[PDB]
């Protein structure tokens, strides 16, 4: 039965008809429907022979499945295989997303569901808009499914089509008088979503069709977004639309120059200077009734520049590339504000350019400001912490001295980000917990990298004190990995991943100095993992004992000097002396083992099942439970 279901599912997936026709031959409708009801997961995605036939494109197979066989359009399947694989798929939806117009019109004439909503309540109409197939949309509109079925983010089919370049589909959809003011809660008014890829004729049509320009959820006009994304022609159209509002025009030109200053894809510095020249000229055009820049303080990251409130001083910085980049970033910060999402990335790119040009102090300042601005908005900043790890490791490799205040500030930012990361992990139970856990583990890894950088550097008394304060704050918070590792456990192992860039130059694990600093900082030395092992258990299991033996001779002498019961005997009844797997490690442990209490005097009475359940003191309960 199940094998026959796989056979008919593969036959429908392939496209043959007589194969599953003979497989269903001489059978009643019960097992025939069961074979057609094979909704089981294939490739990790739920799929059905009718669904996979609609996903195939063979109108013949589905025309047999609806006419000569009894299958229903109410079914579960994929709607978008790349990155979405969302369930609750109608066969008509699968055909519309795949783009087979013949299958779409055949299912419509059959009477398939045209107003179906999935868990993300997405219509086949917006799938047809996503595919850009005009005739499918025309057939669906003529059959009058809907026009205003939006996603859970209130994402209209019009906005989905405007995000792509399907100008014909957009113009046909607005020909049905679907309003462009379908304001999503994210902030898209169908022209924000047009103004990323620069679909010039889509914006042309929307402006022709009374798009009714309005701010987004971030407080940015679509003209501002178009200037932010370095798309000049849509900036031209949005400027030539409705009210000019000269202040908005000037800030739009300034934003266009700013974004052209520090964007990786579009980097035309002369274009930046000329656009800022237009901005300054229209600023100082009329003479009197002049507009003026507000006096924002000189932000310490971008040097200490104070913008250009005069065309003359803008002319002065014509050839200065560094000054032009800084001016662009400063005016970008002024206009876009500090809370907006798109201000962080150009600062990171300029910092990357300076870092690859070995101007390490300036890029540290720029990236530190970027991290501050990202944590003010409370975003996903694990990549930026990793970037600090990379640049600090390269700084150590090129033996340039590392500023202790900067590493202190990035350390406290990392600590706060780990705090809110585990808060999000607790809050997000199982909806999106996997990547949150992965990023939390990567955050711990970056924390170890930064601690290693701090150890490799020379700092003053108060800076070392601040580093110790931050590290002690994290330890008292006690982060724990997915594998149950405590932070010290992560410091003592040998399989901790190290990033492919310059971290491999200096972030060698296990490290003696990192473990010593954590242990002196007040780390829980007797901490246990989910597997039951401890720090001594992991460190004796090192596969490279004499490669860096001195480091071992530190870490082993460190743990014995601070707690770390040498005969802990992990949950699978293995003392770390037994888990030594190396003569050097067991010799060092034997030189550091001590004649002791009912640990060696209780190994026998725990190997033999002696009842300790309230027959021994409460702390001695855990004492036996270890030993």
């Amino acid at each position: 039965m199940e094998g026959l279901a796989g056979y008919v599912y593969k036959a429908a997936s392939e496209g043959k008809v007589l194969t599953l026709a003979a497989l269903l031959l001489n059978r009643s409708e019960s097992d025939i429907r069961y074979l057609l009801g094979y909704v089981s997961q294939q490739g990790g995605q739920r799929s059905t022979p009718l669904i996979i036939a609609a996903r195939n494109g063979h109108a013949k197979v589905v025309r047999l499945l609806l006419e000569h066989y009894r299958v229903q359009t109410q079914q579960t399947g994929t709607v978008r295989f790349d990155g979405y694989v969302i369930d609750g798929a109608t066969a008509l939806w699968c055909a519309a997303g795949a783009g087979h117009f013949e299958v779409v019109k055949l299912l419509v004439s059959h009477g398939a569901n045209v107003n179906h909503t999935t868990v993300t309540n997405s219509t086949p109409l917006r799938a047809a808009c996503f595919d850009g197939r005009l005739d499918i949309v025309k057939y669906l509109v003529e059959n009058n499914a809907n026009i205003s079925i939006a996603n859970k983010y209130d994402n209209t089919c019009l906005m989905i089509a405007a995000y792509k370049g399907h100008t014909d589909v957009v113009r046909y959809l607005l020909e049905q008088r679907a309003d462009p003011n379908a304001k999503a809660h994210c902030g898209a008014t169908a022209l924000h979503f047009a103004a990323e890829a620069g679909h010039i004729d889509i914006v042309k049509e929307l402006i022709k069709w009374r798009a009714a320009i309005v701010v987004n959820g971030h407080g940015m006009t679509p003209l501002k977004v178009a200037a932010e994304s370095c798309k000049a022609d849509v900036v031209e159209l949005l400027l030539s639309h409705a009210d000019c509002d000269r202040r908005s025009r000037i800030e739009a030109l300034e934003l266009l120059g700013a974004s052209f200053a520090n964007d990786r894809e579009n980097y035309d510095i002369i274009k930046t200077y000329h656009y800022l020249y237009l901005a300054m000229l229209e600023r100082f055009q009329d003479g009197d009734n002049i507009l003026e820049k507000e006096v924002l303080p000189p932000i310490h990251a971008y040097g200490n520049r104070t913008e250009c409130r005069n065309p003359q001083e803008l002319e002065s910085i014509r050839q200065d590339r560094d000054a032009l980049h800084m001016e662009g970033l400063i005016v970008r910060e002024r206009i876009l504000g500090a809370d907006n999402i798109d201000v962080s990335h150009p600062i990171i790119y300029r910092g990357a350019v300076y870092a690859d040009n070995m101007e390490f102090e300036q890029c540290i300042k720029l990236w530190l400001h970027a991290l501050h601005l990202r944590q003010k908005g409370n975003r996903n900043t694990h990549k930026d912490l990793l970037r600090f790890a990379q640049v600090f490791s390269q700084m150590i490799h090129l033996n340039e001295t590392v500023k202790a205040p900067d590493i202190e500030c990035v350390l406290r930012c990392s600590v706060l980000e780990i705090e809110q990361s585990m808060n999000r992990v607790k809050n997000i139970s199982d909806a999106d917990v996997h990547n949150a856990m992965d990023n939390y583990e990567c955050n711990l890894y970056t924390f170890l990298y930064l601690v290693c950088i701090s150890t490799k550097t020379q700092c003053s008394e108060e800076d070392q004190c601040k580093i110790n304060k931050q590290i002690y704050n994290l330890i008292h918070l006690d982060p724990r990995t997915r594998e149950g590792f405590t932070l010290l456990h992560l410091a003592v192992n040998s399989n901790t991943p190290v990033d492919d860039f310059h971290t491999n130059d200096v972030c060698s694990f296990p490290n003696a100095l990192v473990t010593k600093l954590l242990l002196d900082c007040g780390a829980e030395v007797n901490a246990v993992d989910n597997e039951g092992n401890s720090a001594l258990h992991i460190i004796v299991q090192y596969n490279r004992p004499i490669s860096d033996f001195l480091t071992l001779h530190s870490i082993i002498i460190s743990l014995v000097e601070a707690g770390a019961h040498t005969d802990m005997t992990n949950k699978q009844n293995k003392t770390p002396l037994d888990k030594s797997t190396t003569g050097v490690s067991e010799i060092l442990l034997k030189t550091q083992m001590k004649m002791s209490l009912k640990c060696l005097a209780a190994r026998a009475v725990r190997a033999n099942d002696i009842n300790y359940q309230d027959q021994i003191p409460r702390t001695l309960e855990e004492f036996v439970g270890f030993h």
Binding site: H345, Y349, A352, D356, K383, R387
Partner: peptide, 11 residues
């Protein structure tokens, strides 16, 4: 590779 090249699209 370069840090600028490794800056990710983020778009």
């Amino acid at each position: 590779a370069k840090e600028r090249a490794g800056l990710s699209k983020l778009p």
